[PDB]
């Protein structure tokens, strides 16, 4: 793989051969993960990603001659996702640059992805792969991307739904792990957003389930503040289990492994509750498998 990677890395270092209709995705293909990763593409990844970010800042910027670049964006994301396997996670400004670049990639929805044009979902997937790779600014542009992911997962395209859910929950895991002090106010704000999305009704059978799943993810960020605060809503979760999970109809019987694991995460602090979550356990196993 090394010789061909070097050949194509030299190939992409030229001018005016890019013009084509779909052949530009050669670069998306150039990113490789099935390789054994010798030093060849290890060293070339820096140059490739630097070129990618520079030309993204150039073309993607609001510009007169260039109103878009679909082949450009697709090939860049393909190569980056397939080659950013090399751990560049917290080192320097590249984290900032790539994070804000993914942000401006998936901030808005010009293309009709609900109708099978799911390139923004490809960007979501690439970010989910490399969210931890670029963390110097994900704590900066953290909300708007998250609600944009909520709309993306609320879109008609089921592929958009799954991609946005995966990216949003990966980002939730990221912020839960490296936010936690510091994110005390941020943790409280996330709890308020939860409150709004969980204690209020929602038409999506997975919306409140991933809300409580984030509770479980943020069981740590609240734990450094007060895990008993969300253990207080754990009693409300007991109310949910004792009432709606045994009324069978109930789509959280279909969707409470998220609830089960989140309850485990938030209940790591607690120890005792009398055999409450086993009728639910069998119920959700039966209507889950």
């Amino acid at each position: 793989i090394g010789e061909l990677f070097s050949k194509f890395y030299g190939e992409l270092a030229l001018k005016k051969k890019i013009p084509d209709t779909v052949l530009e995705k050669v670069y998306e293909l150039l990113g490789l993960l099935g390789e054994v990763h010798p030093s060849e593409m290890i060293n070339n990844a820096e140059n490739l990603f630097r070129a990618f970010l520079g030309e993204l800042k150039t073309q993607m910027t609001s510009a007169v001659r260039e109103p878009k670049l679909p082949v450009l964006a697709g090939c860049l994301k393909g190569l980056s996702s397939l080659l950013c396997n090399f751990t560049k996670s917290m080192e320097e400004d590249p984290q900032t640059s790539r994070e804000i670049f993914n942000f401006v990639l998936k901030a808005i929805r010009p293309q009709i992805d609900l109708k099978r044009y799911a390139v923004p979902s490809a960007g979501l997937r690439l970010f989910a792969l490399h969210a931890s790779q670029f963390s110097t600014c994900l704590l900066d542009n953290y909300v708007s991307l998250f609600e944009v992911l909520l709309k993306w997962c609320a879109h008609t395209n089921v592929e958009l739904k799954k991609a946005a859910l995966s990216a949003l929950e990966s980002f939730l895991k990221q912020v839960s792990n490296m936010v936690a002090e510091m994110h005390k106010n941020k943790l409280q704000y996330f709890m308020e957003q939860f409150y709004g999305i969980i204690r209020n009704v929602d038409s999506n059978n997975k919306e409140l389930s991933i809300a409580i799943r984030g509770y479980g993810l943020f069981a740590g960020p609240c734990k450094v503040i007060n895990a008993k605060d969300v253990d207080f809503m754990y009693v409300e979760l007991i109310q949910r289990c004792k009432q709606m999970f045994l009324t069978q109809g109930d789509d959280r019987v279909y969707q409470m492994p998220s609830f089960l694991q989140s309850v485990a995460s938030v209940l790591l602090y607690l120890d005792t509750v009398p055999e409450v979550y086993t009728p639910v356990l069998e119920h959700l196993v039966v209507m889950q498998i």
């Binding site: 993607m60 609001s62 878009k68 990639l105 901030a107 010009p110």
Partner: peptide, 11 residues
């Protein structure tokens, strides 16, 4: 010949 914003900048 409608030249719009090239990408999804923070708007």
């Amino acid at each position: 010949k409608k030249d719009q914003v090239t990408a999804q900048e923070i708007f």
